[PDB]
């Protein structure tokens, strides 16, 4: 189990209590000075309880911590500053939530003196109540309770879990690079296509530049697959009929003969005379048939090539 969209985070920064007295006005396990009413004795054993609940216009004295609760162990005496403590999470409380963050909340922070014996309960040092609104963000908000005699300071923020975005940690975006898509997720959970892809799902390959729109397609970026009867880098060149030797095409399977070439396959020399100079002894040639010739010989010469 344990699903979660995010967590409310609170850390106790500092606590100040020169006197060392409960909110009763009595000393934390100490006796009163006869003069100047000073507390003499051991300091408070300060720990914190936290209660996070639905935002309420009128803060209630009762009711459950609907968004969760937690508490620290004893983290200091009467006065201590933890703002510079790095790597210590004892002063840290994390409340995970599996609902869309409402953004309105009511929060209760309490400092308590840890009892000195088994028989006595604890007694509260100072109690704080704060209602407000907070957006998911990695930046902290510092709050200070400084109305009473003891004062403390703490910080809060709401963090979405991975693949969650928006004010409610409710918008999803999980990057992928497979058949069904090729994208990353930006800050706002919008999809940003990987290079070479396009479309809302980033699953439509961007073909080779100049690839024929009509006769070319690509299943992979930078490629150009030609429809039947087309060829070339851009798939913009027709394929002549198979067996077409000296011909070209304007549409597939055509065979349009070059100069002085004939036959459906353009494999028949129409100028065998000019091509081979077959006649001899000044005999004059005639392209009598495709791939065929006949010589007219000068007087005294006979034969197809005019040899005496």
């Amino acid at each position: 189990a344990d699903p979660r969209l995010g967590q409310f985070e609170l850390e106790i920064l500092s606590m100040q209590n020169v006197n060392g007295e409960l909110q009763n006005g009595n000393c934390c396990g100490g006796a009163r000075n006869p003069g100047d009413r000073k507390c003499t004795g051991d300091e408070c054993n300060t720990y914190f309880k936290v209660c996070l609940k639905e935002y309420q216009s009128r803060v209630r004295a009762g009711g459950p911590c609907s968004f969760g609760s937690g508490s620290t162990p004893v983290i200091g005496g009467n006065t201590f500053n933890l703002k510079a403590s790095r790597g210590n999470d004892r002063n840290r409380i994390v409340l995970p939530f599996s609902f869309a963050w409402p953004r309105s909340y009511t929060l209760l922070v309490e400092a308590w003196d840890s009892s000195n014996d088994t028989i006595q309960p604890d007694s509260i040092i100072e109690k704080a109540s704060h209602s407000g609104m907070i957006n998911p963000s990695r930046q902290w908000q510092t709050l200070k309770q400084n109305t009473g005699i003891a004062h403390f300071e703490y910080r809060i923020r709401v963090t979405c879990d991975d693949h969650y975005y928006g004010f409610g940690c409710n918008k999803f975006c999980r990057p992928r690079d497979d058949f069904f898509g090729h994208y990353a997720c930006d800050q706002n959970g919008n999809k940003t296509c990987m290079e070479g892809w396009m479309g809302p799902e980033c699953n439509k390959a961007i073909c080779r530049q100049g690839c024929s729109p009509k006769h070319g397609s690509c299943k992979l970026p930078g490629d150009c697959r030609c429809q039947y009867g087309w060829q070339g880098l851009y798939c913009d060149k027709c394929i002549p009929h198979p067996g077409c030797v000296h011909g070209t095409c304007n549409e597939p399977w055509q065979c349009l003969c070059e100069t002085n070439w004939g036959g459906q396959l353009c494999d028949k020399d129409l100028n065998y005379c000019g091509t081979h100079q077959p006649c001899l002894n000044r005999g004059t040639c005639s392209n009598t048939g495709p791939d065929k010739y006949q010589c007219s010989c000068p007087e005294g010469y006979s034969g197809p090539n005019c040899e005496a």
């Binding site: 009128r58 869309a100 999803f172 992928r176 039947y228 036959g263 459906q264 129409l270 392209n287």
Partner: protein
């Protein structure tokens, strides 16, 4: 010379400047003094059975009826019988006339009449543990309760129907909601007073 006439022996014809008169030897396929008239190769062409024949230089073009193709339109094209499915372009081989099908996305096979199992490609398109469901020429996502959209990427906002009552705060959760009652109210929907 033959230079006085800009054009004599027009088509692959070599001028002969004999004392009696100009003479032309010509490339095969042409005939006449200047060899300006195309020999009709269609009078002896192999275009047959309804082909419209067009004369070329020592060649001919067989215009084909719809149910035939080829150099001579001597064979029938299989694309006339529609072997390929809808969405598939049917092309004809020039040599044998067999139909060549180019399948649209979602279909495969020689006739392009076979669904592609997009759920059998090694990846699940459905987020949040959705079940890929195969569709004829396509696929679908069987989403879980609380998730919708084509890929189960949208969390349903079950608080859209305002199920909580008496100004209770509704919490949008996965596949259900939660009511948080005002002071003096109780119930799953905060419907009972006091």
């Amino acid at each position: 010379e033959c230079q006085l006439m800009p054009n004599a022996c027009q088509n692959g014809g070599t001028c002969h400047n004999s004392h009696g008169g100009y003479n032309c030897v010509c490339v095969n396929g042409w005939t006449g003094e200047d060899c300006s008239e195309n020999i009709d190769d269609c009078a002896s062409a192999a275009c047959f059975q309804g082909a419209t024949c067009h004369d070329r230089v020592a060649s001919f073009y067989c215009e084909c009826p719809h149910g035939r193709t080829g150099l001579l339109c001597h064979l029938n094209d299989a694309c006339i019988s529609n072997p390929c499915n809808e969405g598939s372009n049917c092309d004809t081989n020039p040599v044998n006339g067999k139909a060549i099908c180019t399948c649209p996305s979602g279909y495969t096979g020689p006739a392009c009449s076979q669904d592609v199992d997009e759920c059998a490609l090694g990846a699940n398109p459905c987020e949040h543990a959705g079940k890929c469901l195969n569709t004829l020429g396509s696929f679908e996502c069987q989403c879980l309760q609380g998730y919708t959209g084509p890929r189960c990427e949208i969390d349903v906002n079950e608080c859209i129907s305002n199920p909580c009552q008496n100004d209770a705060t509704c919490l949008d959760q996965i596949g259900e909601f939660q009511c948080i009652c005002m002071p003096g109210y109780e119930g799953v929907y905060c419907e009972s007073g006091r």
